[PDB]
Design a protein around this ligand. Structure first.
Ligand code: SF4
Length: 224
């Protein structure tokens, strides 16, 4: 599929069917988007929403989170699992208070330098909260791109990962970047699922190589 057609079809789908009313999407800030991305990394949306609301009520700014005792952060995290995320969350809040005056940094290198934040989460924070022109590559996005463009091979091998990052950059537009990056996460979470994808509901079905060959099970590749 030509990249400009990919972007236009995904944006038209989002306008009619996309999720726009999650709490981190209303009066968006870098702090709210960062907190939601860390909670969503390993936990479903329905479980995350009450924890997001409790964290924002207790810690209205990143300085309030930084100044709290770690034991209180761990207590409020209880039930989310994968507590390395919470230890890194508290360290990153302290780095923003100490190096950046309590104001979330707005440059890619300073965001990616935070503990718990890699290349995809840094691009998510700056694209979704401020409209900066960065692509994302989480598990949802890897599945949609690898099926549509027939990218075989395990993404745990550097050459496969690099091919996927180049494809993601190519299809991600500048105009509408915040809508496009949320739409790709919606598609991989609800339509282009691990098993038995819902291709009849998918805005890419007219150009997707996996759909044309009924070969979704080949993409992305699994670890050998
Ligand atoms: S048409 Fe089917 S396999 Fe292709 S991107 Fe959409 S849901 Fe995934």
């Amino acid at each position: 599929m030509q990249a400009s057609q990919f972007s236009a079809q995904v944006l038209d789908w989002y306008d009619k069917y996309g999720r726009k009313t999650l709490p981190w999407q209303i009066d968006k800030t870098p702090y709210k988007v960062w907190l939601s991305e860390v909670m969503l990394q390993q936990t479903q949306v329905a479980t995350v929403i009450p924890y997001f609301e409790r964290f924002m009520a207790r810690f209205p700014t990143v300085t309030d989170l930084a100044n709290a005792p770690l034991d209180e952060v761990l207590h409020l995290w209880t039930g989310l699992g994968y507590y390395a995320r919470a230890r890194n969350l508290h360290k990153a809040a302290q780095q923003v208070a100490t190096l950046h005056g309590g104001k979330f940094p707005e440059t890619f290198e300073e965001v990616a330098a935070l503990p718990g934040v890699g290349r995809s989460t840094a691009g998510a924070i700056l694209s979704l909260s401020l409209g900066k022109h960065f692509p994302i590559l989480d598990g949802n996005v890897k599945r949609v791109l690898a099926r549509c463009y027939a990218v075989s091979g395990w993404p745990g091998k550097k050459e496969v990962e690099n091919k996927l990052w180049s494809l993601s950059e190519q299809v991600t537009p500048a105009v509408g970047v915040e809508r496009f990056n949320q739409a790709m996460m919606d598609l991989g979470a609800m339509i282009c699922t691990r098993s038995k994808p819902k291709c009849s509901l998918c805005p890419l079905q007219n150009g997707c190589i996996a759909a044309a060959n009924n070969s979704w099970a080949l993409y992305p590749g699994k670890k050998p």
